[PDB]
RNA sequence: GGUUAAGCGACUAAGCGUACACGGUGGAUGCCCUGGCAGUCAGAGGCGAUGAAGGACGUGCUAAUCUGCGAUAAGCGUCGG
RNA sequence: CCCGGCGAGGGGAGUGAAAAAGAACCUGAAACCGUGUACGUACAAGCAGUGGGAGCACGCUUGGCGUGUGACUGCGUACC
RNA sequence: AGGACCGAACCGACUAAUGUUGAAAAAUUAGCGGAUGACUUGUGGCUGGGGGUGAAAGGCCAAUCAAACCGGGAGAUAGCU
RNA sequence: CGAAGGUGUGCUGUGAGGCAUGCUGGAGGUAUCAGAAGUGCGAAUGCUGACAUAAGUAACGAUAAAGCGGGUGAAAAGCCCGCUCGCCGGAAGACCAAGGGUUCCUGUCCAACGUUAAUCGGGGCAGGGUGAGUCGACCCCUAAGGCGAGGCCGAAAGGCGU
RNA sequence: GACGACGUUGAUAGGCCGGGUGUGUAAGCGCAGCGAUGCGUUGAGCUAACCGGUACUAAUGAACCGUGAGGCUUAACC
């Protein structure tokens, strides 16, 4: 009786994958200078 | 260490604690049982006890001092004009806890707490 | 933090839009590549 | 006679699962339908109705008698995982493994 | 902070064979309603000890 | 036969390994071609103020999308097949 | 038709040459993850093999041969 | 009266701690400076790369600056790995 | 009456390799002798996809706080109703501009999304909803500035400007 | 995790009773004072984790695991 929705507008969901590169602070690393 | 200490604080803070406690008794005289965690059962019993040993004997005092604890006069009235006569007689142990299966939302552990007449 | 992008529809517009690239030659030079290209949206006009 | 019964594509990592499925593994259905009862995680309940699923289908489709009926296999396999994005800090984001497990239990006497 | 070398799945193995679950095995059976419950627990029906005390 | 003593000692697997059997995941490989690539031969080398190229919005018995079409709107007239 | 939440999934029935061709669909490799069976393994130190080698379990055979495992032992510090 | 004083909004950013696969690709908490002025802010506009702008730090010019970004010369060149 | 491919087994050559046939597969494959090469991969912090490990570990995003009763439901810590408790109060209330673009309201569903469950939702599906002579835009007027008939300049492109 | 105590033939925990300890003379009422307040009842009332008691409440009858005389060889022994 309620039926089906069978829709599922929402059913494909893309996917992705992205970063960035972060700074670092070396200064104190350093066996020189 | 805890050594010879009592008192669960049950991941709260002093004045959340005495709020919840103030409240899970009003509900526990209003209904006569509830469904609580076993924990907070277990300290229901050493906050409610009292109370109605306090309701056993009727005066002005004794009812603002209720009031203070409980700050319902409803549960007051309750205290003092049925529980303490229907207690009367009974040396402590007014309260029952039943274990009752575990929390559907988080699997805690579930209890029945409910006063030992419950006018049965 | 402010961040670069604080919209605007009427810069947007006045900046990029068709009326701004048909002004000059250069801006009618940059429709022809996206025509060339087959873009479905020429420019920020909407 | 060996009746099977699945659940393809349960939304539970295989680990998980197969921690409730060496409970029962050998059982009568009856001990092992107590045992699922009275175990207090997520995958109890889908084991349990696999199992029941599997009791259903031996009674109906096959012969009878519930009562001499046993989990003679349980395995739980890898299902396909559902890709997802976690957004971490400084701009990073980190792939998330929703994992799917098939479930099987094959009951006979 | 971090593995040098891949751990084998023998080591896996043997890290998690202590993971592995209990069983009840003690259903205990109310003397008046008949039900399998948990011990000290109140069964399904709300019985205890043989006494209906929730209904 | 029993009882002490000395000596030696299969059976255990929480788990793990190797082999094999059967699966899962995954999508390689083979097979396929409405798609491309490079040419040969032959055309045509322009469209536009009679409003182009490219679009926006519409148009159906229904109204997302694609194709067509333009308030005469998946089409109208006429001549041929 | 049945279990299930008037689910998702599944088991039957039926179609089909084929359904482990069931739409997450031709064929289905590998990494990776499991269930079952045989053998080894809880007093023993290291590139994990190789040379020797009991014992056990299978098949053939009628003690042997083949197959798996491999206690113990000599030698042995990956590749570019 | 005041580039006057104390102090909220508002504008800054001196110290400490936390955070450092952060709640955050510069923040939070506790304090701190200015707070009628050489102030601060909304909305528009103009200046374009050896160029702009700069109370000047090689500061800033879309999280990019001792010469931006995009496309092209272009498969630059690489006695080096 | 079973090709290529896949997967085992046996035999065989000094080697790259070859041959045979069990299973799978379901339509192609090619002796021989020549001919041509996108002709052989373990490495290049190689490229693309899939799958591990750490590990069922860290974390679940402000320390403003929750407790009971009833309802619905397959299932309720989280939804609805009620009573208490707590937090903001020059805001964590209310109304807009900018920006967004249906997120708004009602009914249904719980796959995926929601850092858990979900009967709930700014999620899926369907239906509804925005009413102006006076509010705003458009419109009249101009600022900075832009464009600019002729014009003045400039190899061309174009610059400046009445 | 473990370790210790106890499970109705029971003081294991909570409550309750008595005490102690701490704070310091509750509330209500009465009196004095115009009133703030003071005084009496009154060292009163409250009192956590403490001490000594007490089955009032909870520690359920089951069920589960673990077996059924324990290898061989010699040497003495009875």
């Given at each position: 009786?309620?039926?089906?929705?069978?829709?599922?507008?929402?059913?494909?969901?893309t996917?992705?994958?992205?970063?960035?590169?972060?700074?670092?602070?070396?200064?104190?690393?350093?066996?020189?200078? | 260490?805890?050594?010879?200490?009592?008192?669960?604080?049950?991941?709260?803070?002093?004045?959340?604690?005495?709020?919840?406690?103030?409240?899970?008794?009003?509900?526990?005289?209003?209904?006569?049982?509830?469904?609580?965690?076993?924990?907070?059962?277990?300290?229901?019993?050493?906050?409610?006890?009292?109370?109605?040993?306090?309701?056993?004997?009727?005066?002005?005092?004794?009812?603002?001092?209720?009031?203070?604890?409980?700050?319902?006069?409803?549960?007051?009235?309750?205290?003092?004009?049925?529980?303490?006569?229907?207690?009367?007689?009974?040396?402590?142990?007014?309260?029952?806890?039943?274990?009752?299966?575990?929390?559907?939302?988080?699997?805690?552990?579930?209890?029945?707490?409910?006063?030992?007449?419950?006018?049965? | 933090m402010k961040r670069t992008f604080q919209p605007s529809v009427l810069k947007r517009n006045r900046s990029h839009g068709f009326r701004a690239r048909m002004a000059t030659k250069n801006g009618r030079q940059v429709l022809a590549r996206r025509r060339a290209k087959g873009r479905a949206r020429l420019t920020v006009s909407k | 006679?060996?009746?099977?019964?699945?659940?393809?594509?349960?939304?539970?990592?295989?680990?998980?699962?197969?921690?409730?499925?060496?409970?029962?593994?050998?059982?009568?259905?009856?001990?092992?339908?107590?045992?699922?009862?009275?175990?207090?995680?997520?995958?109890?309940?889908?084991?349990?109705?696999?199992?029941?699923?599997?009791?259903?289908?031996?009674?109906?489709?096959?012969?009878?008698?519930?009562?001499?009926?046993?989990?003679?296999?349980?395995?739980?396999?890898?299902?396909?995982?559902?890709?997802?994005?976690?957004?971490?800090?400084?701009?990073?984001?980190?792939?998330?493994?929703?994992?799917?497990?098939?479930?099987?239990?094959?009951?006979?006497? | 902070?971090?593995?040098?070398?891949?751990?084998?799945?023998?080591?896996?193995?043997?890290?998690?064979?202590?993971?592995?679950?209990?069983?009840?095995?003690?259903?205990?059976?109310?003397?008046?309603?008949?039900?399998?419950?948990?011990?000290?627990?109140?069964?399904?029906?709300?019985?205890?000890?043989?006494?209906?005390?929730?209904?």
């Amino acid at each position: 009786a309620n039926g089906e929705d069978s829709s599922f507008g929402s059913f494909t969901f893309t996917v992705e994958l992205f970063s960035t590169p972060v700074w670092i602070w070396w200064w104190p690393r350093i066996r020189g200078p | 260490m805890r050594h010879r200490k009592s008192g669960r604080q049950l991941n709260r803070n002093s004045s959340h604690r005495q709020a919840m406690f103030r409240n899970m008794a009003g509900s526990l005289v209003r209904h006569e049982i509830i469904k609580t965690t076993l924990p907070k059962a277990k300290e229901l019993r050493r906050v409610v006890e009292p109370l109605i040993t306090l309701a056993k004997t009727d005066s002005v005092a004794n009812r603002r001092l209720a009031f203070a604890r409980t700050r319902d006069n409803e549960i007051v009235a309750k205290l003092f004009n049925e529980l303490g006569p229907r207690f009367a007689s009974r040396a402590g142990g007014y309260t029952r806890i039943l274990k009752c299966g575990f929390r559907a939302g988080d699997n805690a552990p579930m209890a029945y707490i409910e006063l030992v007449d419950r006018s049965e | 933090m402010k961040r670069t992008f604080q919209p605007s529809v009427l810069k947007r517009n006045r900046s990029h839009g068709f009326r701004a690239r048909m002004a000059t030659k250069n801006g009618r030079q940059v429709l022809a590549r996206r025509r060339a290209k087959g873009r479905a949206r020429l420019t920020v006009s909407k | 006679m060996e009746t099977i019964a699945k659940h393809r594509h349960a939304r539970s990592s295989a680990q998980k699962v197969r921690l409730v499925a060496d409970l029962i593994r050998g059982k009568k259905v009856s001990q092992a339908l107590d045992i699922l009862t009275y175990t207090n995680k997520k995958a109890a309940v889908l084991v349990k109705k696999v199992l029941e699923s599997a009791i259903a289908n031996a009674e109906h489709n096959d012969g009878a008698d519930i009562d001499d009926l046993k989990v003679t296999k349980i395995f739980v396999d890898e299902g396909p995982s559902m890709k997802r994005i976690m957004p971490r800090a400084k701009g990073r984001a980190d792939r998330i493994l929703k994992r799917t497990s098939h479930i099987t239990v094959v009951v006979s006497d | 902070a971090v593995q040098q070398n891949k751990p084998t799945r023998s080591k896996r193995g043997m890290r998690r064979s202590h993971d592995a679950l209990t069983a009840v095995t003690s259903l205990s059976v109310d003397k008046t309603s008949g039900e399998k419950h948990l011990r000290h627990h109140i069964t399904a029906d709300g019985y205890y000890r043989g006494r209906k005390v929730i209904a």
